Scaffold this active site. Structure first.
Site, PDB file in Angstrom:
ATOM      1  N   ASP A 183       0.806  -1.230   0.000  1.00 21.31           N
ATOM      2  CA  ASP A 183       0.000   0.000   0.000  1.00 21.31           C
ATOM      3  C   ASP A 183       0.830   1.267   0.000  1.00 21.31           C
ATOM      4  OD1 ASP A 183      -2.174   1.775   0.166  1.00 21.31           O
ATOM      5  OD2 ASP A 183      -2.118   1.843   2.326  1.00 21.31           O
TER       6      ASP A 183
ATOM      7  N   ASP B 264      -1.582   5.353  -5.541  1.00 17.79           N
ATOM      8  CA  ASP B 264      -1.924   4.461  -4.446  1.00 17.79           C
ATOM      9  C   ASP B 264      -2.221   3.017  -4.844  1.00 17.79           C
ATOM     10  OD1 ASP B 264      -2.654   3.319  -2.135  1.00 17.79           O
ATOM     11  OD2 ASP B 264      -4.461   4.498  -1.788  1.00 17.79           O
TER      12      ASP B 264
END
Lengths: 5, 374
Positions: free
Chosen positions: B34, B220
């Site tokens: 992440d 992201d």
């Protein structure tokens, strides 16, 4: 995914 | 790097994870990659959706920092106990580091049933780590304790099995074709970039470029969709609608509430437009563009039918270039040089007529003005 800033 | 190739796995639409080990003896866990947060955290207590979890009491090297932490995300949240332990990546550099680890003991809408991951590796900067920037993120610790260069790259391979590669400390050229184009990291918190133009099938969306980055734009890997600021989302949907003339779709489809389905093998990709984001380049008045296909933004949902969810969605907290964007590209997070590189991915999903693309240069004036201030 970050939440807030 | 050959030892790092194909070190990512996942279930389509459920997240890309790398295998890591924590504690002594090693406890093997699958960890979601992440780039949209900065906390390393692992399930540390039983939960309906976990096959395994971090058992602190079984690690001889575990340290309890005796402080709690809470991390909220756009989707879901969790709270837990701060601590540290020894951490290795089996299919990554051959090293063991001490790192901060949040042991998750409570969560809401965070873990994903059947996703096969048990934790999350926040790869962004200290500035947004919780509870505060003094909690050193994993990749900072890795770099400080070893000779791993300050850089990683991600190749996310779409689809119900998914895969890809996280190359730690370098760039593997067999993972991309064509040229790498770099965009500056505007600020080290999220991986923030600046979008300077948007086109739908070559038609300019014609918004003030500040709209594209209101109130930030980020890269992201831990978010599924391409998320756009509300105003930009509405304009994009209208343009995409106009472009896909031969077919009318219900309002619910554009809101991600209804799937579109076709007989297996007959998906009319040609109906939908490509979508280009122009990014600020490293040179004055120079931009480049990355182009994605509907094979990226229409995500397959799992009979004799292919069903898809529209995976461009609205955001209240700026643009998020999620898996929808990343799956087209090999993306280099060049922290050392404060820049993000994009190249056409050697594994991206496409067809015999169109392909994801990275091209430049293009001339764009006053690009810095496209940034939103605060």
């Amino acid at each position: 995914f970050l939440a807030x800033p | 790097f050959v030892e790092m190739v194909d070190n990512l796995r996942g279930k389509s639409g459920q997240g890309y994870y790398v295998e890591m080990t924590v504690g002594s003896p090693p406890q093997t866990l699958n960890i979601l990659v992440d780039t949209g947060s900065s906390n390393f955290a692992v399930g540390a207590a039983p939960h309906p959706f976990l096959h395994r979890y971090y058992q602190r009491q079984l690690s001889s090297t575990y340290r309890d920092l005796r402080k709690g932490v809470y991390v909220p995300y756009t989707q879901g949240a969790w709270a837990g106990e701060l601590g540290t332990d020894l951490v290795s990546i089996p299919h990554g550099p051959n090293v063991t580091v001490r790192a901060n680890i949040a042991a998750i003991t409570e969560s809401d809408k965070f873990f994903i049933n059947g996703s096969n991951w048990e934790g999350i590796l926040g790869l962004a900067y200290a500035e947004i780590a919780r509870p505060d920037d003094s909690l050193e993120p994993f990749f900072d610790s890795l770099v400080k304790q070893t000779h791993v260069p300050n850089l990683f790259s991600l190749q996310l391979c779409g689809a119900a099995s998914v895969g890809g590669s996280m190359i730690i400390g370098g760039i593997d050229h067999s993972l991309y074709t064509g040229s790498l184009w770099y965009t500056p990291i505007r600020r080290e918190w999220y991986y923030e970039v600046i979008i300077v133009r948007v086109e739908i099938n070559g038609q300019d969306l014609k918004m003030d470029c500040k709209e594209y980055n209101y109130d930030k734009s980020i890269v992201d890997s831990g978010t599924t969709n391409l998320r756009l600021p509300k105003k930009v989302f509405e304009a994009a949907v209208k343009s995409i609608k106009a472009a896909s003339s031969t077919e009318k779709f219900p309002d619910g489809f554009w809101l991600g509430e209804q799937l579109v389905c076709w007989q297996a093998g007959t998906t009319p990709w040609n109906i939908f437009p490509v979508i280009s984001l122009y990014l600020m380049g490293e040179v004055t008045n120079q931009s480049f563009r990355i182009t994605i296909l509907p094979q990226q933004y229409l995500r397959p949902v799992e009979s004799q039918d292919d069903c898809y969810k529209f995976a461009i969605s609205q955001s209240s907290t700026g643009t998020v270039m999620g898996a929808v964007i990343m799956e087209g590209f090999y993306v280099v997070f060049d922290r050392a040089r404060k820049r993000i590189g994009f190249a056409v991915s050697a594994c991206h999903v496409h067809d015999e007529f169109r392909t994801a693309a990275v091209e430049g240069p293009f001339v764009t004036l006053d690009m810095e003005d496209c940034g939103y201030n605060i």
